[PDB]
Amino acid sequence: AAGVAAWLPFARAAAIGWMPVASGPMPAPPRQERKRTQDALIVLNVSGTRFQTWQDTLERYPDTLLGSSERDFFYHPETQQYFFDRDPDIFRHILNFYRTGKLHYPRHECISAYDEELAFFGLIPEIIGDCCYEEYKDRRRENAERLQDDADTDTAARQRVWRAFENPHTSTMALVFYYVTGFFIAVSVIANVVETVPCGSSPGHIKERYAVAFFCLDTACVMIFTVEYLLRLAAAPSRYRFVRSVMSIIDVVAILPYYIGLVMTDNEDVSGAFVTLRVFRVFRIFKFSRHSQGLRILGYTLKSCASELGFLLFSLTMAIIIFATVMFYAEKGSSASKFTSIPAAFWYTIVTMTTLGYGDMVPKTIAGKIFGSICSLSGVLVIALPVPVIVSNFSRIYHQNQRADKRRAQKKARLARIRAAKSGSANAYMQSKRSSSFETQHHHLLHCLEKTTNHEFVD
């Protein structure tokens, strides 16, 4: 390559190895200069301290700024030393790279500054040595997600209420609607559970209560639900992508059972389907998701650790299969022998893997207790495997949310500061109109703008 110039004579020497076999004109060296070395210590001071290095060492990488003829922009003539106006520390690592070819990266450095000084000198990040590259990439990743959170969000007719419809703590109508719909979800689910209570829809007194009015009590809620979903269909930034999301899926799953049951009872009386309707008559609990801030956090936590939960399920099936088979083959020959089949030993091994314990069926043979205890221990292990991952992800997500809120407050403060700075500059110009070197020409250009439009500036 171009960074092995110091070994150039050695290759020349290697040529002597094939002189006897050589057959050619031997084009002879092309008028090289200074046969004996007259390398001078070129000094590079970077806003302060000075680094001395050779010229061949500094020129072996011509694609960069310290190579090529670009550096001659920074030659400071009356002192004969390149006066770079950069940081006096990172430049040490850049010089180290020129010496070796594998640039390094210490930990105690801000990424923005280090990358700015690295790109200024024309270097590119991928040259970092493999030893420090991992830590560099991790730091770059965390700063990148910080700037992503920086660039995410800002606050901004009939379609405008959507802004208040995703931040209900914005207007009186939005907040009252949010609170009342939460109350309606709650009263619907409570209405379900109190329909189930024996004093609500059971023969408490056959000869005498069973108020069928619950049949109407839920209905209004469903109707109520429709209106806000209709609003979601009215103020929809996306007509189809909104449905592609999951919250609308929960909404429609909540809405449908009432309507499908009405259609069925208008046309059919299928046995076993009305109970399924009752079962599905509960998922408004998930409709509570918008009110609960932590529910979205939990959902994202589960979605993030999908692989871990999948391995949980696989290992659970593993253990259930193995231990249920062992139980059935080691306990089917007992007197009572409630282990009538492996599909029945599934329940025993799943209530002993979870360390639950019911005692409805327990082993009664010495060949049974051993594997029962081993199954309990293995259940502790298997179930405890993914919980640290899940909880770590949840804590991390909660931290991201809280830091994003603090960051948004910080961004509001920063934009306020920028507005204040512009106001201060305008007031300074006003004072200059009433009666530093830079401000002179700045106000001169402002006067030029004033005259080119013949309109003056007031407070």
Partner: peptide, 28 residues
């Protein structure tokens, strides 16, 4: 803040009245 709570009071009393009317009309 509290005005929104009064708005809740209004909407809840309205819905309670209408559902009371609904439950009162049916058992004829």
């Amino acid at each position: 803040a509290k005005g929104i709570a009064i708005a809740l009071l209004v909407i809840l009393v309205i819905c309670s009245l209408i559902v009371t009317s609904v439950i009162l009309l049916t058992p004829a």
